[PDB]
Amino acid sequence: IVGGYTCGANTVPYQVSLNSGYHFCGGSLINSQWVVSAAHCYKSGIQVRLGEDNINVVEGNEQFISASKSIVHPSYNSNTLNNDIMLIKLKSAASLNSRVASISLPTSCASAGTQCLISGWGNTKSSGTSYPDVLKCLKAPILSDSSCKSASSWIITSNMFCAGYLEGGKDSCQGDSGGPVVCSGKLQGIVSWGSGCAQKNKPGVYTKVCNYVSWIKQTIASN
Numbered sequence: 097i098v099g100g101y102t103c104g105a106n107t108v109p110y111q112v113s114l115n116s117g118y119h120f121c122g123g124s125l126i127n128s129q130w131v132v133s134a135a136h137c138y139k140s141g142i143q144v145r146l147g148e149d150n151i152n153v154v155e156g157n158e159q160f161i162s163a164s165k166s167i168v169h170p171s172y173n174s175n176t177l178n179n180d181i182m183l184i185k186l187k188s189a190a191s192l193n194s195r196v197a198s199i200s201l202p203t204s205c206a207s208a209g210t211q212c213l214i215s216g217w218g219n220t221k222s223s224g225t226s227y228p229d230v231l232k233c234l235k236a237p238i239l240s241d242s243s244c245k246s247a248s249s250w251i252i253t254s255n256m257f258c259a260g261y262l263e264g265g266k267d268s269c270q271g272d273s274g275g276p277v278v279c280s281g282k283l284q285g286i287v288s289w290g291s292g293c294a295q296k297n298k299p300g301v302y303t304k305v306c307n308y309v310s311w312i313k314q315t316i317a318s319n
């Protein structure tokens with residue numbers, strides 16, 4: 097995360113770290129046995145890590161659970177990243193408590209202008225690289241689709257939304273992929289893509305979760 101702040105140990109209990117010998121993506125615990133992340137974070141042999149703060153030091157609130165099944169969205173398009181979402185099932189249910197809790201799926205979509213909380217262990221520099229060991233937080237508003245398209249001339253699909261600042265300096269970044277975008281206590285988005293990080297007129301694009309609620313609910317009910 098660029099231009100953010102240190103969240104505070106376990107203050108984002110639903111944030112998860114996907115690990116394959118090292119942290120490579122973020123995720124969100126939606127229930128005792130399922131995690132949601134970005135389809136482009138797909139990889140086999142994923143171990144989900146819950147209750148994390150410093151991903152390099154065992155602090156006492158962690159729970160390491162291997163994934164048993166990964167389900168990429170049926171219409172995921174890696175070239176345009178349309179439908180960049182993925183479901184992961186844990187081998188065993190996690191022990192829920194205050195430091196490890198799930199986040200609710202949204203009942204309705206959030207409007208441009210709303211403030212959201214984005215988090216992750218991603219890179220913290222706009223030019224260069226420096227990875228934090230503890231979780232970083234960032235407050236960012238959802239942008240209107242028209243203003244996003246204008247400043248970036250990108251092709252945003254109805255399954256995406258931009259959030260951040262057109263002035264740059266604050267944004268999600270490499271390693272924050274798959275992470276949660278929480279607005280009004282609900283999971284409204286997933287960190288998907290962008291051009292560089294915190295670039296002026298280059299805000300972050302996020303997967304619009306409200307459009308995949310039926311898909312998510314059906315999938316969990318049969319797997």
Ligand SMILES: COC(=O)[C@H](Cc1cccc(C(=N)N)c1)NC(=O)CNS(=O)(=O)c1ccc(C)cc1
Binds near residue numbers: 270271288293301
């Ligand atoms: C990959 O390395 C990076 O520094 C960021 C990561 C990233 C991930 C998610 C969200 C943000 C964000 N800004 N909010 C950033 N992405 C890029 O810089 C990608 N842009 S890109 O124009 O460099 C590009 C596009 C497509 C391919 C295959 C490779 C590279």
Ligand SMILES: [Ca+2]
Binds near residue numbers: 148149150155158
């Ligand atoms: Ca740890």
